[PDB]
Amino acid sequence: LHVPMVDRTPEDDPPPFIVAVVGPPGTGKTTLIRSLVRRMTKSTLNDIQGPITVVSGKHRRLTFLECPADDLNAMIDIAKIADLVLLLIDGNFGFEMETMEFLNIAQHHGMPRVLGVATHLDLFKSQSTLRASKKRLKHRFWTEVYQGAKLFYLSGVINGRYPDREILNLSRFISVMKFRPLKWRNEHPYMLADRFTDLTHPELIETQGLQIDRKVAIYGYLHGTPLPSAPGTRVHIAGVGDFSVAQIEKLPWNIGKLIYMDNISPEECIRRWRGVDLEKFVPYFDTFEKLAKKWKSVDAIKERFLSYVRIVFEKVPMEFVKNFNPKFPIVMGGLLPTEIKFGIVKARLRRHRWHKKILKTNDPLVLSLGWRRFQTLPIYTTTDSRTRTRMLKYTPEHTYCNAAFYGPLCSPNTPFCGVQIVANSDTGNGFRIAATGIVEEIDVNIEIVKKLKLVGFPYKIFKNTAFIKDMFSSAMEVARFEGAQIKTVSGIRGEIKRALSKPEGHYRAAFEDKILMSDIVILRSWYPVRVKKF
Amino acid sequence: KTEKPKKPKGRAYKRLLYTRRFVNVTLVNG
């Protein structure tokens, strides 16, 4: 309620509005971008320099973003910072099991206002049967995924595309309908980059090499809670790593000054301002003659009763210069205290809809936590009695685990999205969604328990005079556990008496009934194995 | 969602029921 309140007030025309065009690579996304900006600037500009600052008057300026459908990272990176989803669809999607999983990412990380745009349904359809298919898509999406969004249908008029009233309906929905607040986004300072300049402190043998990072001046506008408040704060560069900032630039008789002037002694602050340690809690007073004679009369207390940024970096290293490219959009985050730390985190999970596998504990998983993408081994555990007595081997449809792993710690219990990684040529989406959940709590130094099983198969048993035919081969083992308490999966406990110098399985023990002849007589509580760190 | 019902739809369900009813009826009256 106050997290939406901090966002809207400084936001005005030079802070843009975030709009992404997301869709398949084959369709004319770029054509829709050109005809969309054809309405804004006068009638003829059909050249793409994206991302670029779109000056849409003094009322609302915007900035537009597209990303290719094969990039696994920035498809995630665009999803959490958006304020409008504009999806372009074909006449060939809807049960395509490998091309439309990003819908779940926008479902989980925060859904803004969404849009369906139908364009290739004219070159493919020629008859009255397109009307039932469009309404069929209205049965699927987006009317079922959110009640309160409009599915648009546009003509296929690829390059040569209209300026007329249909993008006045599109710019009607863009121009009028605004954004719903995203909770955990607006508690962080976060900024999209607009311009990007490389300052190298000109040519020297300490300017280029194998290890040289230079002063990058980056340029953009602010979003969320204010980042310029102090120099030398922290930041995250997506895909590259977490860094600090060196120097940030911003382009949109008094005791209160003398206290912060640290070349002045505090007795000179008191001395200039008019006219010893907190290890003594009780404050200073004068002598009893002075306070007594001074406070003989008590009259003196008788009323006392009834925008734009120019950000400087000393980063990043030389190998990212060789990964320079046209600006496939890059976003800056801001890390908080109790999240710069590392720790073991406990998080609730479940299995994901339109996913077709199972998850062992040894296959590492790619996790998106806030602004950070990290590969971590997801060791699962369950309780069965409001206390843990086992772990599991792979998270089923049967039960839904309590997952634990080690990485960056995240106190405010954020929602938690887990992608199984594929290559750039496996499905058609850069990831495929493995599981989703929520950070439940933070807990360092916890220890999982897996109860193994020493095996003894019964054959002929009575209560007091009890042997096991086949359970052991060493006598000194039983000599050590003679002070212990044994079991059976049926639930009538035993207590071993004495090894009796027979290391053949046969030895005398105790049960508080006679264990039955279709039972399994065992022993419990085995070694509490460690956590894989990565 | 369950894959449990396989049972027919519409008219074919009413035919089978009628046959079963007749069989049940033959016993008790006879």
């Binding site: 005791i255 340690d277 207390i301 008788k302 109790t338 405010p412 130094n445 | -």
Partner: protein
């Protein structure tokens, strides 16, 4: 490790604010020129207490003791029991742990053994009456100090059970811009191993001074006799001025030693109390770091505390300098529109989750 400090000045405060900040610190050159260099006993033992109430923290101590490295961990705590040494009383240890009290995942239930009185640190009823309703003003619902036994100097023998129940994530923002009207004056006069009359003589020492005012003065006689009175005899007295509309307070305490006079003790605590009334706007100098620290670590908003010109001493200036060194949060004072007093208003941007 990199945030560097000097000497034993503000040792507990920099450990506590280092813990809440999550920033590692390094306090060096503690008592390098003194006869017994390095840390004292109570400083080492207090660092053991911080090692107890936390997890993941690492404290490194130099072999000469002059250099201390502090990396904090998460705040856990729980139920335990600490022994206090004879060099400092229990209130020296109850004093910093109130800051970390709501910010744990488990309730602070730690029993304390040690001396229960001194002339420099905090007493029992000072913490119970002067700190705990004031942290209840900042949004703590349930907090309690349970004295099992008292201990007079030099031997002590006191047990106080510290339990904090309510767990918040940040303090609520406070706006105290006006000087309150004090309702009544109460207080506690306790004693161990001695007469039931010298308590009444201390309360005579209060009634000689606080008789001229127009508020009621109602002071409780508290005599402990038996094993509850510890090993050593003694007597102490504590006064609290309370305002029942918003529930504000002020306090002053002192104990009497061997050969001292109970009536002059009562007049001394009374005159220091009225002196603390005159030096104040909203809280006392004894209540000042609690309010300043609680307004710093609140949620991200502007808060205001009316302070007086007498309350700004060197302790307050070094306090805000240490806040700038730890959290880098800055407070700004505006002169009030009144001309009767000379107060000014503290403006605080709360930290929230700012890095």
């Amino acid at each position: 490790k990199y945030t560097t400090f000097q000497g034993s000045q503000n040792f507990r405060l920099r450990i506590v604010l280092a813990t809440l900040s999550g920033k590692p610190i390094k306090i060096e050159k503690i008592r390098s020129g003194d006869l017994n260099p390095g840390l004292k006993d109570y400083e080492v033992s207090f660092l053991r207490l911080i090692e107890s109430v936390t997890n993941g923290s690492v404290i490194e101590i130099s072999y000469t003791g002059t250099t201390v490295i502090y990396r904090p961990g998460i705040i856990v705590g729980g139920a335990s029991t600490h022994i206090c040494p004879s060099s400092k009383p229990v209130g020296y240890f109850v004093e910093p742990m109130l800051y970390l009290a709501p910010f744990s995942k488990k309730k602070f239930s730690i029993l304390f053994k040690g001396i229960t009185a001194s002339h420099n640190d905090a007493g029992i009823e000072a913490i119970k009456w002067g700190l705990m309703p004031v942290m209840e003003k900042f949004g703590v619902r349930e907090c309690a100090l349970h004295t099992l036994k008292r201990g007079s100097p030099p031997l002590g023998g006191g047990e106080v059970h510290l339990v904090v129940d309510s767990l918040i994530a940040q303090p609520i923002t406070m706006h105290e811009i006006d000087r309150p009207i004090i309702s009544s004056i109460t207080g506690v006069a306790y004693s161990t191993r001695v007469s039931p009359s010298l308590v009444n003589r201390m309360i005579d020492g209060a009634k000689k001074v606080l008789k001229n005012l127009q508020c009621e003065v109602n002071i409780t006689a508290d005599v402990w006799r038996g094993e509850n009175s510890g090993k050593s005899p003694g007597w102490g007295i504590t006064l609290v001025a309370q305002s029942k509309q918003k529930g504000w307070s002020y306090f002053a305490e002192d104990i009497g030693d061997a050969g001292s006079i109970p009536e002059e003790l009562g007049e001394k605590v009374a005159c220091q109390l009225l002196e603390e009334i005159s030096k104040s706007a909203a809280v006392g100098r004894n209540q000042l770091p609690l309010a300043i620290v609680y307004m710093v670590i609140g949620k991200e908003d502007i808060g205001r505390l009316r302070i007086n010109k007498e309350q700004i001493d060197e302790r307050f200036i070094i306090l805000l300098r240490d806040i700038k060194k730890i959290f880098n949060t800055e407070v700004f004072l505006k002169p009030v529109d009144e001309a009767d007093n000379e107060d000014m208003i503290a403006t605080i941007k709360g930290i929230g989750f700012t890095n």
